[model samples]
Target chain A: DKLIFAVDIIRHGDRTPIVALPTVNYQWQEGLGQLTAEGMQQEYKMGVAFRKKYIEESHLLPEHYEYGTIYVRSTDYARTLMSAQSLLMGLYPPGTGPTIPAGTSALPHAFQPIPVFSAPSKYDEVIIQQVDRKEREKLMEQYVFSTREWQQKNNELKDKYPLWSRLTGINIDNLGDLETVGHTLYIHQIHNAPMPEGLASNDIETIINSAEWAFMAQEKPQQIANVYSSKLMTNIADYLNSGSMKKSKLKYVLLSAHATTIASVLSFLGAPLEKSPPYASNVNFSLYDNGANYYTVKITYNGNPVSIPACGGSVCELQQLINLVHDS
Target chain B: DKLIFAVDIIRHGDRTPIVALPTVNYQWQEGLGQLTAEGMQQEYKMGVAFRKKYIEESHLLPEHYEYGTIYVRSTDYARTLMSAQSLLMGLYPPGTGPTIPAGTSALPHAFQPIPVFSAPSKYDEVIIQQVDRKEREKLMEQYVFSTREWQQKNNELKDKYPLWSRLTGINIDNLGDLETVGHTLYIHQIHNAPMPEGLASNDIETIINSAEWAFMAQEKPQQIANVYSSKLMTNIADYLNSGSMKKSKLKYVLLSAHATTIASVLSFLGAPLEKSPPYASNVNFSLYDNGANYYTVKITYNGNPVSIPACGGSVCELQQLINLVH
Candidate 1:
């Protein structure tokens, strides 16, 4: 039976600078944010594997695989860009001619490399699953007031517990340290690297939790708050969704996105945050019938498929995913 | 002092096919002939190293080093081809601009890969270096007779020494087994794949014994009568000499040829052949200065220079290297 419609979303392959590990306190260097040598090979292999499975092994021959019919998109990152290049290499190796059968002298040509598409930014509105306008506003307003309120509360508490500042290194008398105070027992600023540049253009919430961004912000509460603003998330999500619209029936889609993009989608879909796994690839899939109804959503890690529960709302609409996050 | 001329001849960097072991005695799969993962890294590193030394460190910016100014030719082999490609990547990374300074933007352009030039087919007269028609004919006649007699004598002795049949799986006494033996050695059938098609179209033995032809031919009678007659040395030397004619100021001429090409050149120049030492680059430098009155030669393994005795024809010509074969 012909595959009605398939959507594959893969975490970009092995990249430079592995990740910003906060537990040990590491940061990403410049162009170091791209895929490494091995990563290129893996992505190339994946592209070949996909071609073999879907094109060669399955029904379609080179002539049948149309370039216009397929679409690919990536998060604006170097790893994703190179991953797409590698995939294209394997899918369309050098030196084969036209895919359409011609004269006997013509024989057969190698398939053309598939194109990859990408979402604009991490926080594009279309892809942001949760948070409404009013709620976002309330959250931002509450955060501004909370900083002061907490300072006042800490002063009162410190009158009773003088040892708290000594132990926490947070002086209630001087609440500036409160911003750096570890959020959630296990969370500390010492565990990450500095944030990169391109990351700023994406959604702020997505940036906060991104392996590149949020990890960098762990030490500076101000930066974390700045990244958490609802406006930043809305702006980023909107940009990202604009690009996602371009994807077609591509054999593969590689997204070299940040951890927050992964986490935001995860949280919106109600996925467990589970302790941040190093170099983890949180993958998502959307399978559709010819008519455009996405029937199944399968997530994966390091090539291993995971079961994605039904993220209920309207059929085939980004709003359904957003609704889940708003209510949460 | 500024280097007026520089030649960078590098050994084909790390390759797949980890070890190109003889397959006849070994039990393994085909395509073991291909480069390994480690080999790719080595080649990539070689490219980077070359770029560091010649391009970046030397500051021979793209403007100064145009494609025509830097000629790169390689032996017609997969390893060399890939090696050249990898090296070029390091030399000229993608997304970089052209070599021209002002015409092209400063944005380092992507490496627009170039093609390698090579010798024509084995029979092409331009590459034929046999001393003369008569000498070549005499050598060929002797070689043909010697090989035929050796095969016949060896067949008779095979029964006494069963190792021959054991290795080749042939019964020497039987004509059919001898024919089978001939086929196994590619004595009669056309050989392809490893050798480019129609490359050594005229002479098969010359291609097979090409390495020996270049090194030992004029030094030893057996080598002279057989290997020299093979004519591979003459062709390669001719090719090298022909290239030298175009550029007199050429202090260093880099030839991107194969292991056999180096082995043959060294063998002809009188260097002993043994397995190439690990990480050793097989390169021979035949030097000349502006005076042109005297010529000197230096051989190197890896980067360390080695001495080649001042030997060759009766009086090593000041203007051109004389053929000592006669």
Candidate 2:
């Protein structure tokens, strides 16, 4: 198969706790909401995998970056930006090729600074946090908090974690705040740090994952599609169609965003995952020209091909993919 | 004068040459277009000065940052972002005051990662390269190249430097490229690097400065005002007037941009400088409220007070200043 263009959206690597937790003493020297060394390595490994798959095995993209060949964009966060930068290190290891003029510095460090592009957090209108403010409030009121299912879950959490309630005075209204506590515990487990004494069981892991899933998975499919993922879907469709028309040399578009961004995109695509997207989880779209006036699209999640029922099968026509997303 | 609000627009501190120059052997380990260690120090010093004036002396702002009190924005460039980061070091020296939670990191380094806001280069609608593409091209054609004065100067440059012409096969069309060369030479001189042979003379510095000034200093006052400085001026004016209405806690607005940005703002305000804005050069707008509804504005360049003649004097009524800018 001839590879024409590809789009990959990967969750940023493992990160330090974004918020302070009540139970665990999680402190990051790099500051809150920043990438850790482990996170950097995770992204670097993903970059290496991408290089092997796209460049070495497939020959879709050049071994080294050509100015117009690849577009790397990330959410305006330090972790995401640094993840993208780390990924570039694996994508274009030093001595593979050289574009920069050798001036005064020692070379062969197997790294070069690649421009990781981003818009301001406030002005970013696509990919991440695309929902309108008023509409988001409306949805939260209608679906998130006021829903009977959420109220039941809230009651169940309070009953199950009475100690937590007693310690933090947390109730249904602020139950969502426990997501940070959950995240901190998860990080502690991953890093092999001693877990909080009372919350050291596998049951705690389940609770943490459940809370994260609950927070993200509350929105309806259409709402997710229309509000969060619509712009990204349209962007991919446009890139695939426009590539054929202009015969553009640009082959790849990579988005480094958060786990929520991945979950939102997946949920809206009719292939929703039950749990939050794991760190470094990737969703890929491969567009192949069919030699006719049409193209085919294949969707993959975390290296496994996924069938989009709307498009009928694992391999669907480009227009079918576009229509499926557009109609949704 | 009771300071209500202040706007400081500064050129990014010492940076590696934006582009590689042919005459000088210059390259940066960090990257081609990046902020250097010295540049960071220069901006840190400026931050210290600002802390002294706005925080210590005036007592208008809190000694430590109060999340919503000050807005720091920069162009989406590594050097500019790093420069802002370095500046925060001096502005909020550790142990002087406290803001961050007591984390695991060692303290008293006077360093914290302050959020320096920025938009992508393409999406940036303010500060750097704010003009539209077609309009800028039109203006450049009319004012930059079309002028006979520039053509005459171009010819003179060619006649004076035949070796440069032969070495690079440069002409009037490519003369604009020499701005980077001039910048490189200027940076070299400032950093006390040995000047390139035959270019050590003070006359070379004048030529370099002249080339940079010619590049930036163009367009009529109103054209420059409307095209370049209008957004920033409106921002400052709006900040001053709205400060009283909302009782805004914001005391400072700092803009980290380039030399050309400073030049554009200065030229538009009718106080044009003869040369390009030097690195770390700042233009300050001090807004004063006279215990009444009315306020007054004072303009300062570098450090010395300068009058916006259209506004009448060194201190102009706030409404008059707004009317003057408006």
The residue-by-residue lDDT of candidate 2 on A51-109, one tens digit each, is 99899998888865554577777787777776776676677654443322333221122
Candidate 2 local lDDT, B1-326, one digit each (tens): 58878888888777665554444465444455666556666777798898899888998788755545777778877667656655665787544422233343221222232445567655775565456788887877766767676666666665545554334233224446555566666666665654455543764665577567666646334465567777777777787777646376678788877776777777777777766777778888888877876777788889887767787656777787788667
Clashing pairs in 2: none
> For all the predictions, what are the DockQ values?
0.01, 0.10
For candidate 1, write residues A89-188 as lDDT tens digits: 5555534322222222111122222333333343332222344667654644454335664445445444523443444333434332332332211232
**Model 2 B-chain TM:** 0.86
Compose the digit string of candidate 1's lDDT tens values, residues B1-326: 12223444555643323222232443222123333223334445555665575556654334232333454544434445445544555555544422222254221122232333333223223212335768755764464324554356445445533544443343345332343233223322322224222323433343223323322332333354325323544433443454345454223334444444444444455553444323215453333333442443334555555433445322233233335333
Residue A38 C-alpha lDDT in model 2: 63
Q: iRMS for model 2?
A: 9.3
Name the regions of candidate 2 deviating beyond 4 angstroms.
A23-26, A96-110, A132-134, A141-151, A160-162, A166-175, A192-203, B1-117, B120-126, B129-214, B219-259, B265-326
TM-score of chain A of 1: 0.47
Tell me each candidate's TM-score. Answer: 0.34, 0.62
Candidate 1 error regions (>4 Å): A1-328, B1-32, B48-65, B90-109, B118-120, B123-254, B276-280, B286-297, B311-326
